Amino acid sequence: RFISLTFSILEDINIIIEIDLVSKSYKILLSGNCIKLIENSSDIQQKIDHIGFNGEHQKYIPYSYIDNETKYNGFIDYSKKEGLFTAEFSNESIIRNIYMPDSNNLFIYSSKDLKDIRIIDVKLLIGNYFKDNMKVSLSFTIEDTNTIKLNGVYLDENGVAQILKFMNLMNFLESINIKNIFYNNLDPNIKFILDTNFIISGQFELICDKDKNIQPYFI
Amino acid sequence: GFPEDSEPISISHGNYTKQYPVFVGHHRLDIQMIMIMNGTLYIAARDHIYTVDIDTSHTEEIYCSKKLTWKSRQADVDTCRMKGKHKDECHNFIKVLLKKNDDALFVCGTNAFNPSCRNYKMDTLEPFGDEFSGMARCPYDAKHANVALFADGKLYSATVTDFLAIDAVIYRSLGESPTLRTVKHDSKWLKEPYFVQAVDYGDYIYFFFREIAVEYNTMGKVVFPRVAQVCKNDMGGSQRVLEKQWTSFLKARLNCSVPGDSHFYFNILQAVTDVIRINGRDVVLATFSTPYNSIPGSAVCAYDMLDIASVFTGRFKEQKSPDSTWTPVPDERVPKPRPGCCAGSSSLERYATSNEFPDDTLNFIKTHPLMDEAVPSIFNRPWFLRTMVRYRLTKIAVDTAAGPYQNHTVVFLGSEKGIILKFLARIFLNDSLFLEEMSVYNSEKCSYDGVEDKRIMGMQLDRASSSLYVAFSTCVIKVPLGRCERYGKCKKTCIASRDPYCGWIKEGGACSHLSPNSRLTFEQDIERGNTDGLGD
Amino acid sequence: GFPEDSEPISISHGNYTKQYPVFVGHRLDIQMIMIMNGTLYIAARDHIYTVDIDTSHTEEIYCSKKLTWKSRQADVDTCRMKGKHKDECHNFIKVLLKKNDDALFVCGTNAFNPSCRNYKMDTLEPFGDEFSGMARCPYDAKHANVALFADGKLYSATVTDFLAIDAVIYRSLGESPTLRTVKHDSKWLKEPYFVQAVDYGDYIYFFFREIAVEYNTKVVFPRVAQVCKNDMGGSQRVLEKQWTSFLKARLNCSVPGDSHFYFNILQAVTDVIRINGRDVVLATFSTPYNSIPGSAVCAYDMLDIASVFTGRFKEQKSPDSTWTPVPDERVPKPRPGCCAGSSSLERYATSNEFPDDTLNFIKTHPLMDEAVPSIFNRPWFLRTMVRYRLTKIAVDTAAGPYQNHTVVFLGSEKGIILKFLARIFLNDSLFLEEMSVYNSEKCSYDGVEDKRIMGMQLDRASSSLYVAFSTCVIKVPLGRCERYGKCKKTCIASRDPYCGWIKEGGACSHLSPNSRLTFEQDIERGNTDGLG
């Protein structure tokens, strides 16, 4: 089925090769303690280069370590020489991007309401947070230290009727406290922007145009 | 001209002070503060808080009495490192230590950039309940300065609320009363303040701190020392204006300057002592220094609590137009309940609590927190001055009952280089007398891995044991108040020292510590030290 | 963090500095000294002495020619009546300038009755009749004034009234009209203290300090002001007989930090000296008298001094408000501060003819917005752990046998001389030597000591520095080569360009401008090889 040929580059550092006979195109994965692998960034990058890592056959390097009451998962992008690490704790989630060279902290974000953040074209983060009994899930992707691209907001448990029918753009976000849950370190101020193709789907699907008003898409 | 720095009557170098007892460990400690309750001495440190029984033993090495352990959970040490702080900064640094009642203890720690507090028993040093939130009561970063004080069962604190330490605030809770805080993101109230000390006097709590001057903005960013009052019976504003905010918060600049043709102000407030009676006048002493990017200098000024209480009854200052000189608001335009007087006091009996304050008065005190006049120091001149040294005076401890007959005043000053300054303040111009200067740092027992941090973290005077405990980042030293032993058989020096804690005893035949109630006949000349006919 | 005071490589106590010659010619009460054509002139009470610089080898020095000018009994009586002290009422010479190569120009207080008289150079006789010296020479010998001849024109800065209230900048003689600052008021000058004037290109620059108008909350800031040499005054309606190019700018001498700490009390400014290709003047600054004692030496490039006056002006948008820069769109077409007949000024023949709006603008906006930035934006020298304040300053831009070393000498209010090697590409300064030169033996009178230095004049021909005190004039040779004597270790450690170790005689000795003998001196570092 799947043979996971492993080995150890360094103490508590292991490489998980994913080889499948049908695919016949082995993959490479990372596995270890996130904290240890976020400081020796220069050392790990050298080893990866030395072990004959395919330059462009692999686009993203998956990493997903399992630890008690934690879920450290992420992917390092070899092409951009960057990295994304996600840590889901008992009460808060942390999303941090560190540039591989010189271990420079471009921008670190954190939220207390996001939980079970999964990683998916370009890979993008998804997360669900319920302020009240109703559960609300929103998809987003932070491009710059001061700008967040929050394209889609999945609603569940008849959320559309509960709130969308009532109000029927920024005022709605402020009302649901999207800004409050997002806490941006290294910068006090924060700005929100929307993707041109952004759509909100809860069955009712809506997508606002350039104007503040929000029209529907499919019903 | 400028007053010259007086000469120390005696100097004690590290060679002699290398024999004073030192706490040490029995690894780093990161000691944060020290306070004394009864005979116990509490040493607040990283992940721990030690106790030392002062009335017991005098061994060359100080041994701990009881050791409380409070380590941050692994689930919390990791969530702090992920945020970006260094491993060394993601620990449980105790930054709040107060006595809750006759037997409880109130302890807060940074807990890896996640403040959380816990109640402890005094007799057994054991947890007394669950950990309630620490927001607005304990700082995130151990490098930051914070103030906390219990008054009438309530907890008054001043620190930063946010991880980035941008939103500094004064807070109150746990007093069976509603919580109150300064206006968020309002530079008129606090502009990047640095809190130093709070004291309880009468019906007000006074916070001493420094902040970027709002009136002195012509030159640029300048730091000014401030004092701020808050009523003890404040219960917040109305439902529409200043809800959950202070309704008596007023601030005024501290005046510590040498009066002349052009006054020279010491702006960087370093430390402030508690309310101490002296010559029948409730007074607090405060040390001020020059900015870090200026010529090093330090000054000690004293302030009468009556003058402080009287400066907040004066006129307010405002900006009639933006970017203009500040002018005192005429009294004819202030509405007549006085902004800042506590409900139920004189001439305000018609207002039960702060909630009944008229809207207009709440708005006025929200937009006019700064008082026009500056708090005048005693004698309008600093009591003490040092200007020919490279170190900067920080901490200050005062003994208002020093000497055989308990009618002197000896003030102890710390420095950023580990040097202790001692001078006999007099109480009616004060001539003053810079008694001694000493280096207490013990590199043999305080240095850790070839690192020397000499910043004094706290000083606590123990009148029962005639000792002064000076806490460093990595050690605590028990320095005797008198240091009579150094003089020894040199009667000429023992008399010329003019040290209140010392004296000459013919029965023993040597200079030695003098007890407050020592039947033995002592010979001293504190008034004027004449060595004629003696020595050398 | 604040820069710490460097350690003096060499120290000469008062005991050693007694052999140096001392000139005492009664209470002298010297006012100033100056060297001209290789001859040192001594300006003092009722007498002008001329020490012969040529006789350097002579340990003793006696005034070859003595100029006598005592106030008339009538003027002395008037001064005594008006209430001045009997001692203060005397002829104190306060202005001495070279009119031409065959004439000498001398002004004295004449017991609170300013008057000037021309003197011959060779014979030293009253070449011409005297005349009133009002606004050209101060009344009180304690007050400071500046005077500087340029193209046969006498620029002066002092007080006009006996009460010393109306400070004025003046210009007389030279077949040109009389020009002065606005009488009284505060727009142009608010209680200034004049220090020095220099001549550079076509602009005369006055250095002084005055009551800051920008700081409503009383602080004294140092200022530099320019005037056009060919200024002829304003029109018949505006600025008649007044300056039409008076502009002033703040001097920036501070240590860059979180909050800038400025040295505000300007003490002395050297003349224009060519150093490292650039024309630069050095200026000493100290902290106020009621502040922690500290001093700093900043240098200013004449190019930057000219450039600041081409920027935006200062103005008060409303009374009792912060000062804001004048908008660039609101400046009249002929830029105030530019002299007539220069670039883009062919139309205006002379300063006499201008548009009235320009004159009103320059009369209501004399202060420039930007401040004169110092070389490297940091003081070249700092002392903060002493009780005295640096005052006078002399610079030698031709030090050493190779004449490519810049040595700066600094005086103090307590008689201590400071010597540091200014290096100009920015590097740390090099404290060479500190020495107390006051000779209490030969200078003290009636057990009264006044160590305040009244002036320093460097003479390259004799390689000496003459330091004048109120009661004596001391000829201090540059450095202290004779001190070290035969030993070579200390001479190589001091790193003083004025001292070297002779190869033939095998002894350390002072250097000369031109000598065949080889030299030995390690400027970069001294390892004390062959320590004795």
Ligand SMILES: *[C@@H]1O[C@H](CO)[C@@H](O[C@@H]2O[C@H](CO)[C@@H](O)[C@H](O)[C@H]2NC(C)=O)[C@H](O)[C@H]1NC(C)=O
């Ligand atoms: C700080 O206190 C000094 C105390 O001297 C104040 O100096 C006085 O200022 C007033 C008015 O400014 C003068 O009338 C007094 O003559 C000054 N005192 C002396 C001894 O000369 C100073 O103004 C205060 N600074 C403030 C209030 O900002």
Ligand SMILES: *[C@@H]1O[C@H](CO)[C@@H](O[C@@H]2O[C@H](CO)[C@@H](O)[C@H](O)[C@H]2NC(C)=O)[C@H](O)[C@H]1NC(C)=O
């Ligand atoms: C503290 O009080 C003692 C007495 O309780 C003072 O000692 C006496 O001082 C008076 C002067 O007021 C002398 O005339 C006596 O001779 C002293 N008695 C002694 C020395 O036994 C002492 O001066 C007080 N200290 C102060 C006021 O600083």
Ligand SMILES: *[C@@H]1O[C@H](CO)[C@@H](O[C@@H]2O[C@H](CO)[C@@H](O)[C@H](O)[C@H]2NC(C)=O)[C@H](O)[C@H]1NC(C)=O
């Ligand atoms: C005096 O000079 C200093 C340094 O040349 C000036 O400090 C500069 O201030 C500007 C903004 O005010 C900053 O952008 C620069 O970075 C500062 N320089 C340095 C080296 O840090 C100061 O502003 C000047 N003051 C005046 C009144 O001209």
Ligand SMILES: *[C@@H]1O[C@H](CO)[C@@H](O)[C@H](O)[C@H]1NC(C)=O
């Ligand atoms: C203190 O001890 C050191 C040990 O190196 C010594 O150099 C110094 O002179 C001593 N200071 C005294 C004895 O005052």
Ligand SMILES: *[C@@H]1O[C@H](CO)[C@@H](O)[C@H](O)[C@H]1NC(C)=O
């Ligand atoms: C000192 O100890 C006694 C008994 O141990 C206790 O009753 C008292 O309250 C303590 N002092 C204070 C200030 O609490």
Ligand SMILES: *[C@@H]1O[C@H](CO)[C@@H](O)[C@H](O)[C@H]1NC(C)=O
């Ligand atoms: C300088 O002095 C010498 C001799 O004293 C004289 O010959 C010469 O002309 C003087 N210089 C000038 C410019 O007059």
Ligand SMILES: *[C@@H]1O[C@H](CO)[C@@H](O)[C@H](O)[C@H]1NC(C)=O
């Ligand atoms: C002056 O010129 C000589 C010529 O060789 C050179 O050795 C010396 O270094 C120069 N001085 C300085 C300060 O550079």
